[PDB]
Write an enzyme that holds these catalytic residues in place. Sequence first.
Site, PDB file in Angstrom:
ATOM      1  N   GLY A  13       0.810  -1.214   0.000  1.00  0.00           N
ATOM      2  CA  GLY A  13       0.000   0.000   0.000  1.00  0.00           C
ATOM      3  C   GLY A  13       0.841   1.259   0.000  1.00  0.00           C
ATOM      4  O   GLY A  13       2.070   1.187  -0.101  1.00  0.00           O
ATOM      5  N   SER A  16       3.033   7.604   4.101  1.00  0.00           N
ATOM      6  CA  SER A  16       3.119   9.060   4.225  1.00  0.00           C
ATOM      7  C   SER A  16       4.008   9.704   3.134  1.00  0.00           C
ATOM      8  O   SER A  16       3.496  10.484   2.320  1.00  0.00           O
ATOM      9  CB  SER A  16       3.600   9.454   5.619  1.00  0.00           C
ATOM     10  OG  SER A  16       2.711   9.005   6.628  1.00  0.00           O
ATOM     11  N   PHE A  17       5.323   9.381   3.116  1.00  0.00           N
ATOM     12  CA  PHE A  17       6.271   9.973   2.168  1.00  0.00           C
ATOM     13  C   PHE A  17       6.656   9.035   1.003  1.00  0.00           C
ATOM     14  O   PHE A  17       7.653   9.284   0.318  1.00  0.00           O
ATOM     15  CB  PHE A  17       7.525  10.469   2.914  1.00  0.00           C
ATOM     16  CG  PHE A  17       7.238  11.478   4.002  1.00  0.00           C
ATOM     17  CD1 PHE A  17       6.993  12.813   3.691  1.00  0.00           C
ATOM     18  CD2 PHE A  17       7.215  11.096   5.339  1.00  0.00           C
ATOM     19  CE1 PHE A  17       6.731  13.747   4.699  1.00  0.00           C
ATOM     20  CE2 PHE A  17       6.949  12.031   6.347  1.00  0.00           C
ATOM     21  CZ  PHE A  17       6.716  13.350   6.022  1.00  0.00           C
ATOM     22  N   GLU A  19       5.440   4.917  -1.265  1.00  0.00           N
ATOM     23  CA  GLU A  19       4.778   3.618  -1.362  1.00  0.00           C
ATOM     24  C   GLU A  19       5.525   2.533  -0.573  1.00  0.00           C
ATOM     25  O   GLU A  19       6.759   2.520  -0.551  1.00  0.00           O
ATOM     26  CB  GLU A  19       4.621   3.217  -2.837  1.00  0.00           C
ATOM     27  CG  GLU A  19       3.502   2.221  -3.082  1.00  0.00           C
ATOM     28  CD  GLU A  19       2.759   2.367  -4.399  1.00  0.00           C
ATOM     29  OE1 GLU A  19       3.421   2.447  -5.460  1.00  0.00           O
ATOM     30  OE2 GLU A  19       1.507   2.357  -4.372  1.00  0.00           O
ATOM     31  N   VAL A  20       4.761   1.631   0.077  1.00  0.00           N
ATOM     32  CA  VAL A  20       5.286   0.507   0.866  1.00  0.00           C
ATOM     33  C   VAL A  20       5.165  -0.785   0.040  1.00  0.00           C
ATOM     34  O   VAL A  20       4.104  -1.058  -0.520  1.00  0.00           O
ATOM     35  CB  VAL A  20       4.620   0.380   2.274  1.00  0.00           C
ATOM     36  CG1 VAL A  20       5.318  -0.680   3.125  1.00  0.00           C
ATOM     37  CG2 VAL A  20       4.615   1.720   3.008  1.00  0.00           C
ATOM     38  N   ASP A 129       3.029  14.109  12.825  1.00  0.00           N
ATOM     39  CA  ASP A 129       1.834  13.695  12.079  1.00  0.00           C
ATOM     40  C   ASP A 129       1.178  12.386  12.609  1.00  0.00           C
ATOM     41  O   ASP A 129       0.600  11.629  11.821  1.00  0.00           O
ATOM     42  CB  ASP A 129       2.158  13.574  10.575  1.00  0.00           C
ATOM     43  CG  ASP A 129       2.395  14.901   9.866  1.00  0.00           C
ATOM     44  OD1 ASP A 129       1.611  15.858  10.107  1.00  0.00           O
ATOM     45  OD2 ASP A 129       3.329  14.969   9.029  1.00  0.00           O
ATOM     46  N   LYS A 131      -1.464   9.890  13.898  1.00  0.00           N
ATOM     47  CA  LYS A 131      -2.904   9.695  13.669  1.00  0.00           C
ATOM     48  C   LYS A 131      -3.267   8.172  13.634  1.00  0.00           C
ATOM     49  O   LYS A 131      -2.337   7.364  13.632  1.00  0.00           O
ATOM     50  CB  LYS A 131      -3.340  10.432  12.373  1.00  0.00           C
ATOM     51  CG  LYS A 131      -2.777   9.869  11.074  1.00  0.00           C
ATOM     52  CD  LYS A 131      -2.377  10.986  10.105  1.00  0.00           C
ATOM     53  CE  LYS A 131      -1.979  10.462   8.740  1.00  0.00           C
ATOM     54  NZ  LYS A 131      -0.714   9.673   8.778  1.00  0.00           N
ATOM     55  N   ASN A 134      -1.249   5.704  11.481  1.00  0.00           N
ATOM     56  CA  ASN A 134       0.098   5.447  11.993  1.00  0.00           C
ATOM     57  C   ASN A 134       0.094   4.470  13.186  1.00  0.00           C
ATOM     58  O   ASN A 134       1.137   4.259  13.811  1.00  0.00           O
ATOM     59  CB  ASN A 134       0.799   6.769  12.368  1.00  0.00           C
ATOM     60  CG  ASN A 134       0.829   7.801  11.259  1.00  0.00           C
ATOM     61  OD1 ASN A 134       1.051   7.504  10.077  1.00  0.00           O
ATOM     62  ND2 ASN A 134       0.592   9.042  11.620  1.00  0.00           N
ATOM     63  N   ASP A 150       6.201   5.515  10.971  1.00  0.00           N
ATOM     64  CA  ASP A 150       6.606   6.817  10.410  1.00  0.00           C
ATOM     65  C   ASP A 150       7.205   7.814  11.441  1.00  0.00           C
ATOM     66  O   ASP A 150       7.293   9.010  11.138  1.00  0.00           O
ATOM     67  CB  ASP A 150       5.446   7.477   9.611  1.00  0.00           C
ATOM     68  CG  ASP A 150       4.929   6.657   8.437  1.00  0.00           C
ATOM     69  OD1 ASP A 150       5.753   5.993   7.759  1.00  0.00           O
ATOM     70  OD2 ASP A 150       3.711   6.717   8.163  1.00  0.00           O
ATOM     71  N   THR A 168      -5.479  14.330   8.393  1.00  0.00           N
ATOM     72  CA  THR A 168      -4.354  14.857   9.186  1.00  0.00           C
ATOM     73  C   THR A 168      -4.768  16.049  10.066  1.00  0.00           C
ATOM     74  O   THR A 168      -4.162  16.268  11.121  1.00  0.00           O
ATOM     75  CB  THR A 168      -3.164  15.255   8.278  1.00  0.00           C
ATOM     76  OG1 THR A 168      -3.607  16.179   7.283  1.00  0.00           O
ATOM     77  CG2 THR A 168      -2.489  14.061   7.623  1.00  0.00           C
TER      78      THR A 168
END
Length: 267
Positions: A13, A16-17, A19-20, A129, A131, A134, A150, A168
């Site tokens: 998926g 944040s910064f 793609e995984v 960040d 949330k 995360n 993250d 966010t």
Amino acid sequence: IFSDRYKGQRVLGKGSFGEVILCKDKITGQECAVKVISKRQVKQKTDKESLLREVQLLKQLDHPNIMKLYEFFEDKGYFYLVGEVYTGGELFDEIISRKRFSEVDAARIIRQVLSGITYMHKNKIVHRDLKPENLLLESKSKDANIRIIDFGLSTHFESKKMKDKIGTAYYIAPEVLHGTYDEKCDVWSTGVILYILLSGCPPFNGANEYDILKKVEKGKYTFELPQWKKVSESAKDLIRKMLTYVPSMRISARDALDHEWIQTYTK
């Protein structure tokens, strides 16, 4: 290089910064998670050496509630952050799926989230960040632990995310919006998470990002909604201590973890 150490499989998926993707260690065969931070779409907030200096410290850091970072790679096109892969999915998706969610259950979560923030704060690492996205579950197991992902990436990396803008805005700290923020911002975000776990509703509402940010900025919230009458006065005292507008006056993660509510509603 990344090719010499890990072999890429499927796309787990988007993060944040970047793609995984699921990757396997070319020698041990261990399944890992890699965050491909594209240099074209993501800017570097720090000097090339200070990013590597922090990454080195992050690799040594080990805690049962934080994602373990294994290695870092960098080329002329991307940036590769390799860490532990988690199979339990998003914590909130498990909560919603449950039949009953008591104050004892929310304290089990927040106690775990605070322990994690306390460790990173002692080791001069900030999230900013933080949330529900995360907050991942380690495995699909019955007594599985929460893992925070993250951590420290906001400090070194910075693109547009309209579909994730409203998401966010609910959890962001007022100091972050001002520009001058420290470690206290993470305690505010955990406060928002705690507020939502107890009532189901965000303390700062709005039909759009701006409307939510304006409410966040003013810092005023209530315990007026009917769901707050069932909630203990000790929990409300902790939310009050956590959502203290002035960061200097806002209580630390260590002191938040050391509360009557956290102690009595856990072990």
